[PDB]
Amino acid sequence: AETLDPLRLPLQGERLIEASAGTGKTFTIAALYLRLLLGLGGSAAFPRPLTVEELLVVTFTEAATAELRGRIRSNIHELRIACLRETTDNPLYERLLEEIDDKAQAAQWLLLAERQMDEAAVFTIHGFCQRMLNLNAFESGMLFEQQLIEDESLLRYQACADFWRRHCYPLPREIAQVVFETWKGPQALLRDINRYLQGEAPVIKAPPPDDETLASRHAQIVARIDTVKQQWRDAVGELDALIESSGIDRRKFNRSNQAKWIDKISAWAEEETNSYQLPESLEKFTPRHPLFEAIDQLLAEPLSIRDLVITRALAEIRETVAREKRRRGELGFDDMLSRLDSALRSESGEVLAAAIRTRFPVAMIDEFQDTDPQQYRIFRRIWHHQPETALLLIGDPKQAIYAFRGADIFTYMKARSEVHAHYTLDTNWRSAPGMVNSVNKLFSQTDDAFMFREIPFIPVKSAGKNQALRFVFKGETQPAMKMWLMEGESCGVGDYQSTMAQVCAAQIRDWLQAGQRGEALLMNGDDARPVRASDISVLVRSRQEAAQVRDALTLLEIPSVYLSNRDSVFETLEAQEMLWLLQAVMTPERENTLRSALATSMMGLNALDIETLNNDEHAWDVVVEEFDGYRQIWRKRGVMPMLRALMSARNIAENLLATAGGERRLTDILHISELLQEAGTQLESEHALVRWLSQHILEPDSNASSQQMRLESDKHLVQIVTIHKSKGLEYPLVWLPFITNFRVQEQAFYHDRHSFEAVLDLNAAPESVDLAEAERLAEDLRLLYVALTRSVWHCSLGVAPLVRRRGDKKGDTDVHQSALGRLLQKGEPQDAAGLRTCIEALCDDDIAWQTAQTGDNQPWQVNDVSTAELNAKTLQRLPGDNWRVTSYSGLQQRXXXXXXXXXXXXXXXXXXXXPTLTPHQFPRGASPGTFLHSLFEDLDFTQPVDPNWVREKLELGGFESQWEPVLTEWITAVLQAPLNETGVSLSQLSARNKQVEMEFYLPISEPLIASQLDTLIRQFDPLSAGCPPLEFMQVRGMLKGFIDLVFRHEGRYYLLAYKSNWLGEDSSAYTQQAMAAAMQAHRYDLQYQLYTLALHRYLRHRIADYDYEHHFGGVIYLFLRGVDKEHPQQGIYTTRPNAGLIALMDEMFAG
DNA sequence: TTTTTTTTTTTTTCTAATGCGAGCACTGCTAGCAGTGCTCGCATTAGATTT
Ligand SMILES: Nc1ncnc2c1ncn2[C@@H]1O[C@H](COP(=O)(O)OP(=O)(O)NP(=O)(O)O)[C@@H](O)[C@H]1O
Ligand SMILES: [Mg+2]
């Protein structure tokens, strides 16, 4: 191994950089990145400068991608600034500038990079394969649009039920009897194999042959026991044994059992008494005869169907899932990586690789100590060969804690084997000069602490920037590390979790109270800062642990967050209260479903409130009323407006904040509301939303957005976080209360030392159990390391004489099975006293141990807060006046009051009196009318009608052929009808004189008031005598409309508008009278007058020397259904604006 | 194609380990008996991760 200079590293081929924690591994990535952008290092430099989009960086967490992206952004910026200033105040940039040749061109490339930084390539693996597939699809053999799915547990469970249906339901009674014992149903089976369904499939040690069924195995074991049954039945009834005291004479009664126990094969369980007849058992207390020894053969291998079922099911469920996801064309996290691996694996995949070597002719993988077999197979297959591509693997093998997630150390060690070059970073930059020496001391206690020959520990040296770091608590400095030793002899896990959590809390509030007085300080040299509850972090292994920490820690009135919390809001009680409320406001009529909502802690009502409110009817009616207004807000304005109104009126948003802790509760309420919007839009119903909320109250899921928000950022908080979620992070003061604890793995899963392949032994044979438990322990060490390197100034950690074995007083302390204990005892069992001494041995000036003494004084001393007077400003002017763009439709609107305006007539008369090719029968609505119009839109008037053209319109319309012969006739009647007094046929109109569907915008300047208009209307209009004055609110703005048709005949223009409607009638129900009736009913009066104004202004605009009276021909409403070959008048209607009404009207809209 | 009623509660783990208690065989010490060494069985207690 050689030491590393960032600027000396050749970037060619594969390169491994290894170094301990806090050594700046992440920190160097920046420097190499810059170097790559500029093509620097000379001999060590890459052949050619690279573009930001060609640099691949792959990091472990989505958060890390964000951070590193930012840091690289900043560093590029600063370096550019320096290149323009030619000097800089930072040493690394200074050396870069010494290496750089031309500073100007350098600054140019940098600028360009800085711009490119948006698309800059940084990913995780699961974020990399994702992109890469969707990037090059053919090669990868993917669809182009992949719909992701994040819930793979439901598909998986589905498949497990499918298996357990086809491979279990067929079983006859007797085999089923055996299946039942090992697991009830697939709900449990899934729980057993679940870690093995996900990620790379394991290899199974000594798998059953492929052809063996359940009935086969079962018949086998049937006979295996049967032989012993006959045999024991034959040899029974004789004492040839040498009788011994300790073997108790009543042992012969056991034999009665066995000769009795031999009846049927139906049982899978041999008797406990059989253990007595083992020649290894008895001879310890007389070889007997062979079968006496055969029982030992029978009891040597546990009799089970288990391995076979886990094998068949594990192979099947995996496939089935993959197939169902193929059918939907979906994808998933493990499935992403898997699919890219497979894609490369395939013969075609070699093309694929070639593209990537083009896309990223370098890659820098960070946090590589966590690596998967698949991952390394990929990165190798891509970059292991070919020139001009580099590869940079960055990792500390000491830190790989993720084995549970499928990562494996052994494949890292493999890569470490196949890389010729190693590089090492010497100095820890992260933490105090004390903390370095502490850790070094603790891991130097034994030889080969990490108990992998390939993972040697080395001493590291603090930096010079950190030399002055110190932490002070009540004056004199506190040693960098303090181990809190528990008192007493034997300790169970529970006692330990109570006490140590508690003590941690007591210590934490002391630091705080001394932090508000400014006594305790985090000091770099003379500089300082008090210890806020922010800078403290508490690292725990699991969730239950963390809750155990918080409950005690909030009991002392210190607000605390848990950063790994995946719990979802809907699991809380506030979601439930929200349900009670929404459910009440929905139907306040029901006495019960309302009162329930009133009793909620959210409403904050006493028992006296609800009591009296059950008595006086007036109040109860008032409540019912207010909720009835809430339903209104609910229907009109949506949801969140309602809950807003309720919160204001009830004053709850304030009363919670008054209440202690209620701040959290209020955050939950607001959050839930915010979700009720997101689901509120997509669902149209008011009611289906209450449908929805319940369904989420039942299944909280895991999912991201419904996960709880942090309670408050106002106050600095205790950031209580799991180890794994602390990786790559930094925590100035750090607590490890429960670190002593351990978990002995009963499952047997390990790696072969030779092949380095993940091997599962479905059989419990103790060897493999050992081979695994060694792994569990080494991993626990790596947890300890990572946990200790997190701190900057101070880290405290608990130590206890923990006892796993249930015997009380021995001298057994299992602490040597703890990760930390083994480091204190150098892997030697001791007594609790020996524990205390071994702690005392290493304790000098850094490590300092105090006994763990429970105490309680005061939760904490807030001393409260002072604020001010405060007020909200209030708008004075109206928010805005009326400016609206409307059509005539925005005029009739609706009438609130005695008179309501509708197209239809309310009065109805019943009829008691008692060829389908007719116009009246045509469908109705906006849809049918839009079709009818759209015909005449392209339709040609001079040519007759082509029924084929009809059929292909109706076909497009979706209308059947029930119409085509019915239509093509009618249209001709339309086009052939003469019009007005001129007698014009629609047929006679040349496309030169046609104008189809004119859209116009007509400005209305000063506000247009109804009564100031309808008097002008009624005055000159005979038709406006009918019905009240039109009523529309004051409006100022633009007006829209579509002329159906405009055409000129005899040098004289016309205005044409089609109308259809009329559900009830066919015949003369269209007359001169009834047309004028309906016109007055739907207020087409104002409509045609308005158009005439528009057409008027448009002609006045277009036609040089235009005059209204000379050029204008009147207005024509054509009721399509109204057209009948029998009567020329029916369906057509014509009126002329007075020319005296337009004269004043136009002036009115002008001012 | 017509129409009436009525209100609420229930359950909850399994496996394993020890500690002791009861009963017995032997063996040594002063043929029987007391003790010890022993051994099994019944109840009680404890613990069940990590994106
Ligand atoms: N060369 C350097 N000069 C100055 N400060 C540095 C240098 N290298 C690292 N640091 C600082 O030291 C700390 C640790 O750096 P970091 O890059 O996280 O190391 P690391 O190896 O990635 N730690 P981890 O992710 O836990 O292994 C950071 O707070 C850096 O700012
Ligand atoms: Mg890092």
A254 CA: nearest nucleotide by C1':
B40
CB A1066 within 8 Å of CB A1119: no
- The position carrying tokens 């008179």 is A899
Q: After which residues is chain A broken (C to N over 2.5 A)?
A: 285, 914
Going by C-alpha positions, the residue among A1090, A1136, A1094, A1143 that lies closest to residue A1115 is: A1136
Which 3 state secondary structure label does DSSP give A427? strand
Q: A472 — phi, psi (to 5°)? A: -120, 130
**What tokens appear for A125 in the block?**
């693996």
Which two tokens mark A822?
């083994």
- Which of A625, A587, A588, A620 lies closest to A605 in space, CA to CA? A620
Name residues 1-40 of chain A with a Cβ under 7 Å from nucleic strand B.
Answer: none
Q: Are A1096 and A1108 in contact (CB under 8 A)?
A: yes
- Smallest CA-to-CA distance from A502 within A551, A538, A560 is with A551
Secondary structure letter of residue A202 according to DSSP: P
Residue A201: burial class (beta carbons within 10 Å; 0-12, 13-18, 19+): middle
CA distances for A545 relative to A726, A1103, A1149, angstroms: 16, 87, 76
Residue A419 gets the label, from left (phi > 0), alpha (psi -120 to 50) or beta, of: beta
- For residues A1006 and A1036, the answer to whether their CB atoms sit within 8 Å is yes
CB-based contacts of A460, cutoff 8 Å, min separation 6: A20, A23, A426, A427, A428, A436, A440
Residue written as token pair 């369906």: A1131
Top CATH class of A151-331 equals: mainly alpha
Cβ within 8 Å of residue A281, ≥6 positions away: A275
Helices A214-235 and A173-182 cross at an angle (nearest 10°) of 90
Phi and psi at residue A1036, to the nearest 5°: -140, 130
* Ligand 1 lined by A732 (C-beta under 6 Å): no
Q: State the burial class of residue A570 (Cβ atoms within 10 Å of its Cβ: 0-12, 13-18, 19+).
A: buried
- Residue A506 CB burial class (10 angstroms; 0-12, 13-18, ≥19): middle
Closest ligand 1 atom, CA of A25?
Answer: 21
Please state which CATH number belongs to domain A565-710: 1.10.486.10
Q: How far is the CA of A285 from the C1' of B37 (A)?
A: 14
Burial label for A784, CB within 10 Å (0-12, 13-18, 19+), is buried
Helix (H) or strand (E) holding A1048: strand A1035-1049
* Residue A623 CA, nucleotide B8 C1', distance (Å): 27
| Maximal C-alpha separation, chain A | 140
Residue A18 CA to residue A393 CA, distance in Å, equals 9
- CA quadruple A167, A171, A175, A181: dihedral sign: positive
* Closest residue (CA to C1') to nucleotide B40 in the complex: A248
Q: A376 with A200: CB under 8 angstroms?
A: no
d(CA A523, CA A506): 23
* CB of A21 sitting under 6 A from ligand 1: yes
Q: Nearest nucleotide by C1' from A810 CA? A: B18
d(CA A372, CA A414): 11
Contact A320, A197 (CB under 8 A): no
Beta strands in A366-520 (DSSP E): 390-394, 422-424, 427-428, 461-462, 469-472, 481-485
Strand boundaries in A685-744, DSSP class E = 718-722, 731-736
Assess whether A145 (CB) lies less than 7 A from strand B.
no
Q: Quick check: A189 and A183 in contact, CB under 8 A? A: yes
| Helix (H) or strand (E) run with residue A234 in it | helix A214-235
Arch. (CATH architecture) of A872-1151: Alpha-Beta Complex (3.90)
A60 touches A370 (CB < 8 A): yes
Report whether A250 contacts A257 (CB < 8 A).
Answer: no
Residue A310: CB partners within 8 Å, gap ≥ 6? A192, A193, A762
Question: Ligand 1, atom 7: nearest CA belongs to which residue?
Answer: A24
Do the bridges between strand A994-1008 and strand A1035-1049 make them parallel or antiparallel, or are there none, so unpaired?
Answer: antiparallel
Q: How far apart are CA A852 and CA A324, in angstroms?
A: 56
What's the rounded Cα separation, in Å, for the pair A530 and A517? 8
| DSSP for A53-91, written as a single string | GG-EEE-S-HHHHHHHHHHHHHHHHHHHHHHHHS--SSH
Closest alpha carbon to A39 in A82, A121, A101: A101
Lookup: nucleotide whose C1' is closest to A402 CA:
B50
Beta carbon of A591 within 7 Å of strand B? Answer: no
Q: What is the dihedral of CA A1073, A1075, A1078, A1082, to 10 degrees?
A: -140
CB A1032 within 8 A of CB A891: yes
Question: Could you write out the DSSP letters of every residue in A1083-1113?
Answer: THHHHHHHHHHHHHHHHHHHSTT--HHHHEE
Cα A189 to Cα A179: distance, rounded to the nearest angstrom:
11
Nucleotide nearest to A272 (CA to C1'): B40
A242 DSSP 8-state letter: P
Q: Which positions ≥6 away from A1003 have C-beta within 8 Å?
A: A1037, A1038, A1039, A1149
∠ Cα A807 A810 A814 (to 5°): 75
Q: Say which residues have a Cβ less than 8 Å from residue A1137's Cβ, sequence separation at least 6.
A: A1088, A1089, A1092, A1114, A1115
Residue nearest to nucleotide B24 (CA to C1'): A248
Identity of residue A464:
G
- Does strand B come within 7 Å of the CB of A808? yes
Which residue is nearest nucleotide B38, judged by alpha carbon to C1' distance?
Answer: A246
d(CA A278, CA A298): 10
The answer to whether residues A441 and A405 touch, using CB atoms and an 8 Å cutoff, is: no
Ligand 1 proximity of A728 Cβ (cutoff 6 Å): yes
Residue A537, beta-bridge partner list? A719, A734
Question: In CATH terms, are A1-150+332-425 and A426-564+711-871 the same topology?
Answer: yes
> Which of A5, A7, A8, A26 for mutating ligand 1's site (highest number of atoms within 8 Å of CB)?
A26
Asked if A257 and A233 touch (Cβ cutoff 8 Å), the reply is: no
Cβ contact A352:A139 at 8 Å: yes
**Residue A1141 near residue A1089 (C-beta atoms within 8 A):** yes
Reduced to 3 states (helix: H, G, I; strand: E, B; else coil), residue A878 is: coil
3-state helix, strand, coil in chain A (%, to 5): 50, 15, 40
* Residues whose beta carbons lie less than 5 angstroms from ion ligand 2: A 25-26, 728
Instruction: State the Cα–Cα distance between residues A358 and A361, nearest whole angstrom.
Output: 6
Is the Cβ atom of A445 under 6 angstroms away from ligand 1?
Answer: no
How many angstroms separate the CA atoms of A255 and A233, rounded? Answer: 10
Distance CA A925, CA A105 (A): 69
H or E segment at A1002? strand A994-1008
Residues in chain A: 1151
Residue A1131 near residue A1120, CB atoms below 8 Å: yes
**What is the domain partition of chain A in residue ranges?**
1-150+332-425, 151-331, 426-564+711-871, 565-710, 872-1151
Q: Which ligand is nearest to the CA of A20?
A: 1
What's phi and psi for A635, nearest 5 deg? -65, -45
How far is Cα A967 from Cα A971, in angstroms, rounded to an integer? 6
The whole-angstrom separation of Cα A185 and Cα A162 is 12
**Burial of A999 (C-beta count, 10 Å sphere; 0-12/13-18/19+):** exposed
Let me know how many helices (H) and strands (E) chain A has, helices first: 41, 31
Question: A299 CB contacts (<8 Å, ≥6 apart)?
Answer: A270, A274, A275, A278
Helix (H) or strand (E) holding A1133: strand A1132-1135
Alpha carbon A248 to chain centroid distance?
Answer: 65
Domain A1-150+332-425: give its CATH code. Answer: 3.40.50.300
* H or E element at residue A1052: strand A1052-1059
The contacts of residue A613 (CB under 8 Å, 6+ apart) are A598, A605, A619, A620, A623
The alpha carbon torsion through A357, A360, A362, A365 (nearest 10 deg) reads -110
Write out the two tokens for A495: 């006692």
φ, ψ dihedrals at A680, nearest 5°: -70, -40
Closest ligand to Cα A465: 1
Residue with tokens 């020649």: A279
Q: CB neighbours of A231 closer than 8 A, spacing ≥ 6? A: A291, A294
Which method resolved this structure?
A: cryo-EM
Closest protein CA for atom 6 of ligand 1: A429
Resolution in A: 3.8
A1108 Cβ neighbours under 8 A, 6+ residues apart: A1096, A1139, A1142
How many angstroms is C1' of B35 away from CA of A245? 15
Whose CA is closest to A843, among A1116, A445, A285, A413?
Answer: A445
Q: Give the separation between CA A717 and CA A720, rounded to whole angstroms.
A: 9
Report which residue type is found at A747.
Q
CA of A622 to the centre of ligand 2 (A): 62
Residues 6+ apart with CB under 8 A from A571: A700
Find the A431 Cα to ligand 1 centroid distance in Å. 10
CB A126 under 7 Å to nucleic chain B: no
Beta bridge partners of A996: A1045
Q: Which long-range contacts (CB under 8 A, 24 or more apart) does A758-762 make?
A: A758/A200, A758/A202, A758/A203, A758/A373, A758/A408, A759/A202, A759/A203, A759/A204, A759/A205, A760/A196, A760/A202, A760/A203, A760/A204, A760/A205, A761/A204, A761/A205, A761/A206, A762/A204, A762/A205, A762/A306, A762/A307, A762/A310, A762/A311
- Separation of alpha carbons A398 and A781, rounded Å: 9
- The set of strand B positions with any atom below 7 Å of a protein CB reads 17-19, 23-27, 37-41, 46-51
Per-residue DSSP letter, A986: G
Which atom of ligand 1 sits closest to the CA of residue A29?
A: 17
Q: Give the contacts of A761 (CB within 8 A, at least 6 positions apart).
A: A204, A205, A206, A748, A749, A750, A768
Residue A245 to residues A250, A282, A285: CA-CA distances in angstroms? 11, 13, 9
The answer to whether A409 and A396 are in contact (CB under 8 A) is no
Give the Å distance between the CA of A728 and the centre of ligand 2: 5
Instruction: Report the nearest-CA residue for atom 24 of ligand 1.
Output: A728
A248 contact to strand B (CB, 7 A limit): yes
CATH architecture, range A426-564+711-871: 3-Layer(aba) Sandwich (3.40)
What is the CA A813 to C1' B19 distance in angstroms? Answer: 19
Q: Roughly what angle, to the nearest 10 degrees, separates helices A306-328 and A173-182?
A: 80
Rg (CA), chain A: 43
Question: What is the DSSP code (8-state) at residue A173?
Answer: H
